Design a protein around this nucleic acid. Structure first.
Length: 211
RNA sequence: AUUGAAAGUUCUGUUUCGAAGAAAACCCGCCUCAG
């Protein structure tokens, strides 16, 4: 199980609107993170024949684990929800085993935007390594699933709804999955939460929780 | 190539006209550079 870390510098922020008034999300979903990685290999093409229907040139990277977190302060504003965090820093962790270290590192440098066109984001540095699996009590900053238990004080937790990769195809809505975000609503920031969990990969001290 | 893809809330307008800080008032009364 290989892992990679990337540091991104945002220009003005990101904007992803909720499916189904156009409120937006607080942090990008894993689908956007996987699509940004896939942009490095599928550049120039917008429709691929999956075999039955044209849905996206991203239905092949669906099994790559990804998380992300903030490192600065921002504000969420509706004026079409937007998350303004100019000159901020984003840390993205990719955990997978499908490809070797070289391919993941090459695709990691090829991230251009997160969300829509205006949300450009440069790349400052990357790290690649081998991760270890643990199950003891850990402290994490990355968001995780709803079913994961919590031992600490419930004070900085929010509930959001994301979608699986089934939504990659047009004319079809993805499955609803609940997610827990350790975020302060105003001003925007990230806080540490202690969880027990069952699977946690150590990617340099900042344990990443998946289930 | 990411609930992503496709879009200007843009066009037209004077804070303008008018109204003396003006009138009265002494620096002035005393002193050899001398043998």
């Amino acid at each position: 199980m290989i892992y990679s870390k990337v540091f991104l510098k945002l220009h003005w922020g990101f904007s992803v609107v909720k499916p189904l008034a156009k409120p937006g999300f607080y942090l990008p979903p894993p689908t956007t993170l996987i699509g940004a990685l896939s942009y490095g290999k599928f550049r120039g093409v917008d429709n691929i024949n999956l075999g039955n229907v044209y849905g996206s040139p991203a239905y092949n990277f669906r099994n790559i684990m990804a998380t992300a977190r903030l490192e600065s302060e921002g504000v969420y504003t509706e004026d079409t929800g937007k998350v303004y965090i100019p000159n901020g820093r984003l840390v993205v962790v990719y955990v997978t085993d499908s490809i070797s270290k070289e391919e993941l590192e090459k695709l990691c440098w090829s991230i251009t935007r997160i969300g829509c066109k205006e949300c450009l984001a440069s790349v400052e540095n990357v790290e690649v390594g081998e991760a270890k699996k643990v199950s003891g009590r850990v402290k994490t900053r990355y968001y995780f699933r709803d079913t994961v238990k919590v031992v600490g004080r419930k004070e900085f937790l929010e509930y959001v709804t994301f979608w699986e990769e089934n939504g990659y195809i047009w004319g079809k809505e993805g499955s609803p999955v609940r997610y827990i975000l350790p975020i302060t609503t105003y001003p925007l920031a990230s806080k540490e939460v202690e969880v027990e969990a069952k699977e946690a990969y150590e990617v340099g001290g900042e344990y990443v929780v998946f289930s």
